[PDB]
Amino acid sequence: DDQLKQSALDFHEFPVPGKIQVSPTKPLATQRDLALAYSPGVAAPCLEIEKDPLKAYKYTARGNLVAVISNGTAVLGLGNIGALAGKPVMEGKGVLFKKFAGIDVFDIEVDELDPDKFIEVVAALEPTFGGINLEDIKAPECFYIEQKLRERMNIPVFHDDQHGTAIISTAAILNGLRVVEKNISDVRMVVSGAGAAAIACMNLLVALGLQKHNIVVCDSKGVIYQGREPNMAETKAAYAVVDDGKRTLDDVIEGADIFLGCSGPKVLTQEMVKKMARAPMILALANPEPEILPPLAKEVRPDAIICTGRSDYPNQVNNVLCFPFIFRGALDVGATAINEEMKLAAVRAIAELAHAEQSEVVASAYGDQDLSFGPEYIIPKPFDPRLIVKIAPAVAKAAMESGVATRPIADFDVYIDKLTEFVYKTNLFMKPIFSQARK
Amino acid sequence: DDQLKQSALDFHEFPVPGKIQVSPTKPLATQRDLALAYSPGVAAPCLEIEKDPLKAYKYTARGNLVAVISNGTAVLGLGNIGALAGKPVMEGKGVLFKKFAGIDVFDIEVDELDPDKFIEVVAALEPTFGGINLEDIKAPECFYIEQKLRERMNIPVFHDDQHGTAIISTAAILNGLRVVEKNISDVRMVVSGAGAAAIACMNLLVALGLQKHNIVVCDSKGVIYQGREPNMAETKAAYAVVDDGKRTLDDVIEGADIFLGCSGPKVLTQEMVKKMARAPMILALANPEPEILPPLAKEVRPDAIICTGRSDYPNQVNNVLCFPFIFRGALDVGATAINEEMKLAAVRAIAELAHAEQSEVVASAYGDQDLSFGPEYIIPKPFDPRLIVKIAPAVAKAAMESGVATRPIADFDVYIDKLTEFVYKTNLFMKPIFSQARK
Ligand SMILES: NC(=O)c1ccc[n+]([C@@H]2O[C@H](COP(=O)([O-])OP(=O)(O)OC[C@H]3O[C@@H](n4cnc5c(N)ncnc54)[C@H](OP(=O)(O)O)[C@@H]3O)[C@@H](O)[C@H]2O)c1
Ligand SMILES: NC(=O)c1ccc[n+]([C@@H]2O[C@H](COP(=O)([O-])OP(=O)(O)OC[C@H]3O[C@@H](n4cnc5c(N)ncnc54)[C@H](OP(=O)(O)O)[C@@H]3O)[C@@H](O)[C@H]2O)c1
Ligand SMILES: [Mg+2]
Ligand SMILES: [Mg+2]
């Protein structure tokens, strides 16, 4: 860790402080440019925005501006390091929002810990941005903050932990159901740690067509029992099941078709993977340590699908796969909210990007792409330059079918051409060389 | 005004909508680069910042980040347009910070117009920034907001509509008595329209040795003197003169020596300036129309020292003339607040430049610079490319003297060389050519 520690600190300590900077997009080097960008000329756009508040997107950078707002209570895996301690991390995601999406990001870091104070602070900042990206707020404050902001602010509010990797998890589950012949209705699914990502994973599966009479949730206290605690809250113990014993998760896994373990490592053992249905779809989604190492489950059950947050083994589920392109589509369509139908469209696009892959000027040498749709390849790789081309025009299209768009765009072919032009100027061809060299 | 209004509506939005973008300053090519910016690497600066918050200025952009926070209730001269309608102006100011001082700006705008909830929003936003630049908050709540914030946050909070003219004008006065061989001990004062940019001015002048009994404040309703109204209005009783029956601005002159005025249309006539004592010191600071129309008054009395705010005539007072550069001081010294010993150290630094100008690679032709200290050269031109070299180290030294800094600067020669090198790579040589060819 010492080598990584020294490598990361030197990354942006010495050359310039920080990994982010603000530069004009206007050519101003003479007079009559400073006389209309400020003082007697900049008052003309304000008059137009004064009478037509929807004209702001044309004259200002609101339509390309999202905010990574955080109180710094649960940052990455660090925990409650505190406000400004997560200041680099926010900037880091801002960088991604540019490179992969061309979205300018402010990295606001609210100091308040009270949920209501945070809600008020972020809601007051509505005119500045065109979308909120609440990040690293510890549960259960995250749920309250996101729901209140979505119901109050008339701007896209999209939490990353909540329904971020949830999108990719839903896409992976759908593609797994497509791989092994198992209709989603007949799938009996198990949850571990119903919170943060998992709580939205289950909701997205339900929306896509998973029925709650086949779902079960088990946590450190055990299964969600109808009588485990009088505080029968819907935040965690929703759609609960009667006690009927089932103290441990061993019998829960007995007759299970998915694992979807997002929270809580090492909760899955070899015998338990053995006690599964015809084809399990273990989703070990714990970044620190996966719930079960993929090779062990592969040895125990040759015919299975395993997804892991780490990139060591295939079917890697990364947050970067989803949010920048979701926000790209929502902003470009001029949407006012990221509802469930946009998320469903994104899930469909990610699923269809996995079994409709050809050409894309495959590197004749190097690379070793060698990916074909199967148990190994369920979801597109984190950096496919064909995601933004697929996620963004679908999410935008969802706005067209939902009446939440304020700037409808015609000729989606032109939008496709613009996105392909954007991805033509951002290509990471050195990581295929590294991957090929390592083998 | 379609030659001006329309030409400003489409400033540069045709190629890219809106000024200002947040662009990465990192090597943005390889996957390893997007591993010390997020996930396994970005967690390394976080520990150091958590252990010692002062490390952030090394790892984050806080040492070069200010925030132009505003609720948009008095924008330029438009008025109470709103937080959103004032968005371009902020961006305008932002580019100035990146053009003349290289300061990154987040153009945050608060939707809440209440004069007490604004403070909480900004105080919560404190960790994001290294300085605050409140602008377009209308009077009298601007003073309240600034005073409340300066006691709460531990970073420089610096208003725009009060200190914007309180410094340069003071320098003008500090320079005016130089050419009229007077002393601040006995000079009499007149103030018109004690508003945002007026009532805060004389305080700084008091720090230079202008006794309060020589100041007479005036307003639209005649004269602000103790006794005119049964209730003495707040923040104006300090300089309110005793009751003497002086109910009009036409009589309170009594051969005064200064006419600092921050109001709307003209208040003085030819005989009004005539009533002044020898060597008047008019400071008509109204932006739309001059309060005196200098040349006419210059015809009434010779040896006049009229100072205005419009660039058409000499002795022009501009906010950009001082405001980035003083910030460039504090941010480069780690100041926790802006005292009156740095707000006044940036007064003796811009007043010195008027009679300390020579060489500086004078344009052998063109330009028609022709500046010599005297009745028509009181303050440096709004863009002497040399203000940032004279103001910023002066403010930094005043910070280190007052015990308000956190990262004291070493031997100043390196600092002056750095500021000069920044000056060299930012030149506006086309402006003198325009000013010479037009005449
Ligand atoms: N795309 C990604 O790579 C990605 C995205 C999101 C999350 N994750 C990972 O998912 C995990 C959870 O996310 P989080 O940061 O939101 O953590 P968290 O809030 O602590 O986890 C959610 C819940 O899981 C439970 N839990 C914790 N440890 C457990 C254990 N050993 N066994 C069973 N339940 C346990 C806790 O409730 P009880 O203590 O009552 O059980 C907690 O309320 C982290 O490891 C995170 O890195 C990865
Ligand atoms: N750097 C610059 O050159 C610069 C910067 C900012 C502002 N300004 C100028 O300063 C003025 C306002 O700026 P601000 O926002 O700082 O102050 P403000 O809050 O607008 O207050 C201006 C004051 O002027 C008074 N006033 C208005 N009309 C008047 C009239 N006809 N006769 C006498 N007094 C009158 C008002 O007094 P009552 O409250 O009694 O009406 C008010 O208190 C404008 O003229 C503006 O162009 C110049
Ligand atoms: Mg985070
Ligand atoms: Mg202003």
Author numbering:
A (entry chain B), B (entry chain A): 2 to 440
Paper excerpt:
While reducing NAD(P)+ to NAD(P)H, MEs catalyze the oxidative decarboxylation of the TCA cycle intermediate L-malate to produce the TCA carbon source pyruvate and a byproduct carbon dioxide (CO2) in the presence of divalent metal ions such as a magnesium (Mg2+) ion. The hybrid-type MEs consist of an N-terminal catalytic domain (ME domain) and a C-terminal activity regulating domain. The PTA domain does not possess an enzymatic activity of PTA but acts as an allosteric modulator of catalysis; that is, binding of some metabolites to the PTA domain increases or decreases the enzymatic activity.
While the cryo-EM map of EcMaeBholo clearly shows the PTA domain, the map around the ME domain is unclear. Furthermore, in 2D classification of EcMaeBholo data, the ME domain was ambiguous. These results of the cryo-EM map and 2D classification indicate the flexibility of the ME domain of EcMaeB. Consequently, the catalytic site of EcMaeBholo including cofactors could not be modeled well although we added NADP+ and Mg2+ to the sample. Therefore, we had to conduct further local refinement of the ME domain dimer to observe cryo-EM maps of NADP+ and the Mg ion.
